[PDB]
């Protein structure tokens, strides 16, 4: 008469807050005989162990959902990848909390993964919206040629297809490159005067230094960069006038855990109302079957709709209707100049400074 809700976390404070939120969620949701019992574990390196131990513990506990928070800080390469296969074998829903890699949306391998933060392709969508604002028709895009770079390029191309416009150039450089001089010279020689970059922090710093050496970042240019490109020493190497974007409450994690727990509880309560309900198997060993109502509960979770702002998911199994902040680098001090509405780009009273001087809009052609 109780539903087990697995969780994975690192901080004892994290797990205490999670337990407190779950306990408080059982106050104003009826007086029936159904409740929820939590079960959380710690992290482990040597991802073979990180997968085997999690599988054993959560399957033996027979939990309904497996939450995954941010990966361990010292191991930035750590990811929920070994978790999403173990919990995707039995179609048990997973709720990522902080990871923003765009490879997850490909649901031919990562079968049963969700989250509540929009990945970096929505930044490409915001870039297209921005290009639809200031009367600019030609933009040069530089990508890391990795999976994220290809995803961003495809998203931008699809966005530009509807507008019937075209991209003058799409630069492509490998991650961790050393000599991008030929690519930068090719970009400079062309008549297109809008440059967009999307790569790691090291690559962003390298290309900023190369552009500074080639003296391309003077007056009359247009700069547009995302989030990872202005992190770390890439900020220390960043040129003046750049335009960057970042989320709101990216890793605050408090409202994150509260909202995730509330959504899971409401989905479970709505699911148990109807008949035709099964339970997770004892898939520790010997259970070659799958969950009978796996896809059914996945659809039920994906069809969620909330007012407490709104938390609505799309066919991509992600979160939308998110806010954003628009930042323009000035005196090597990031300054907020406007907030990106759910779809509008209404700015603030701040006056922007373009590379060089003055606020005059630079064109995109070399006429």
């Amino acid at each position, epitope marked *: 008469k109780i539903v087990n809700i697995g969780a994975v976390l690192s*901080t004892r*404070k*994290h797990e205490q807050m999670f337990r407190e939120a779950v306990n408080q969620a059982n106050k104003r949701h009826g007086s029936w005989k159904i409740q929820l019992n939590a079960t959380s574990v710690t992290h482990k390196p040597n991802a073979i162990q990180m997968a085997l131990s999690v599988c054993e513990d959560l399957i033996s506990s027979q939990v309904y959902a497996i939450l995954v928070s941010h990966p361990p800080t010292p191991n930035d390469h750590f990811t929920p990848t070994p978790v999403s296969y173990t919990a995707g074998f039995y179609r048990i829903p997973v709720l990522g909390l902080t990871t923003r890699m765009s490879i997850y949306s490909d649901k031919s391998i990562h079968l049963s993964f969700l989250r509540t933060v929009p990945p970096y392709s929505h930044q490409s969508s915001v870039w297209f919206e921005m290009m639809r604002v200031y009367n600019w028709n030609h933009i040069i895009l530089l990508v890391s040629d990795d999976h994220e770079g290809r995803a961003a390029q495809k998203r931008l191309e699809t966005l530009l297809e509807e507008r019937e416009s075209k991209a003058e150039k799409v630069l492509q450089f490998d991650p961790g490159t050393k000599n991008v001089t030929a690519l930068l010279m090719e970009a400079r020689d062309l008549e297109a005067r809008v440059i967009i970059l999307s790569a790691s922090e090291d690559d962003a710093a390298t290309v900023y230094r190369a552009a500074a050496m080639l003296n391309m970042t003077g007056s009359g240019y247009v700069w547009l960069v995302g*989030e990872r490109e*202005i*992190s*770390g*020493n890439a*900020l*220390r190497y960043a040129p003046d006038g750049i335009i960057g974007l*970042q989320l*709101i*409450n*990216g*890793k*605050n*994690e*408090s409202a994150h855990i509260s909202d995730a727990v509330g959504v899971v509880a409401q989905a479970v309560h709505e699911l148990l109302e109807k008949e035709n309900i099964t339970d997770p198997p004892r898939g520790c060993v010997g259970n070659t079957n799958i969950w009978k109502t796996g896809p059914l509960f996945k659809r039920v979770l994906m069809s969620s709709k909330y007012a407490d702002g709104r938390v609505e998911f799309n066919e991509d199994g992600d979160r939308k209707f998110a806010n954003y*902040s628009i930042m323009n680098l000035q*005196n*090597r*001090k*990031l*300054v*907020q100049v406007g907030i990106y509405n759910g779809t509008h780009v209404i700015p603030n*009273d*701040r*006056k922007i*400074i373009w590379p060089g*001087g003055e606020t005059e809009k630079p064109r995109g052609y070399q006429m």
Partner: antibody, heavy 118, light 114 residues
Framework: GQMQQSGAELVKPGASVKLSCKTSGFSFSTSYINWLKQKPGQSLEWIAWIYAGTDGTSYNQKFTDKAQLTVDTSSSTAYMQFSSLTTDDSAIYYC???????????????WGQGTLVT | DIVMTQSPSSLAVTAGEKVTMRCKSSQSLLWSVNQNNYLSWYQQKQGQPPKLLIYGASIRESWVPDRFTGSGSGTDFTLTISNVHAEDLAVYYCQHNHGSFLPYTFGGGTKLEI
């Protein structure tokens, strides 16, 4: 808005100490976390700043390899570690955050207090 | 690094009489791109609350009294007070805010008394 710091602590020569600076009362995630110094009988000394959102870090030339920094958004608690501390390191430490006025940085506006060391 | 000193370093004068404080910098701190200079005065007497007294050398803070006034441009700056009161007995500093000078710097200090 107000900030809280760690208590008094004395360290033996060659030891390391990790201090903290609690934050509350303003938008934390879009701010810089500066660190200062004040040895009595001598002028102050800027050390470093940390950008909250993206962990942007900068080091002074003197303290290029003498310390390290970290942050945590969930608890709004700053982190800073001193390395190779000695008797010459005995001086008060502060955590301060710069502010924006009229759309331009006007200096230091948020201040802490205490946190002696010897 | 812009290292500036304030002259003189101390004074023991009768209360209620105007005094002059000046802080002279090495380079001109003007910035015509934004048409704003990077000047700021500070104070700390009890409880070690270093608070920005007057910034920009032309605009006072909201709570700073009328009698306080700052002035100066380029490298020379002038801090003029109409009347001296015992509540103003403290140590002052001058600090720039221009992003060119890495790191920042603080004034020499003036432990005034009476």
């Amino acid at each position: 808005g107000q900030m809280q710091q760690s208590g008094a602590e004395l360290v033996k020569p060659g030891a390391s100490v990790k201090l903290s600076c609690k934050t509350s009362g303003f938008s934390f995630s879009t701010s810089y976390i500066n660190w200062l110094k004040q040895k009595p009988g001598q002028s102050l000394e800027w050390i470093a700043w940390i950008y909250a959102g993206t962990d942007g870090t900068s080091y002074n030339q003197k303290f290029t390899d003498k310390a390290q920094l970290t942050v945590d958004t969930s608890s709004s608690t700053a982190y800073m570690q001193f390395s190779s501390l000695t008797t010459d390191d005995s001086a008060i430490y502060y955590c301060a955050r710069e502010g924006i006025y009229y759309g331009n940085y006007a200096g230091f506006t948020y201040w802490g207090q205490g946190t002696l060391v010897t | 690094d812009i290292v500036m000193t304030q002259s003189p370093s101390s004074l023991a004068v009768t209360a209620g009489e105007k005094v002059t404080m000046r802080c002279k910098s090495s380079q001109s701190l003007l910035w015509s791109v934004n048409q704003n200079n990077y000047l700021s005065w500070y104070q700390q007497k009890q409880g070690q609350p270093p608070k920005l007294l007057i910034y920009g050398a032309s605009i006072r803070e909201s709570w700073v009294p009328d009698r306080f006034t700052g002035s100066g441009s380029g490298t020379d700056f002038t801090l003029t007070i109409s009347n001296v009161h015992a509540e103003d007995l403290a140590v002052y500093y001058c600090q720039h805010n221009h992003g060119s000078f890495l790191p920042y710097t603080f004034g020499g200090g003036t432990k005034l008394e009476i």
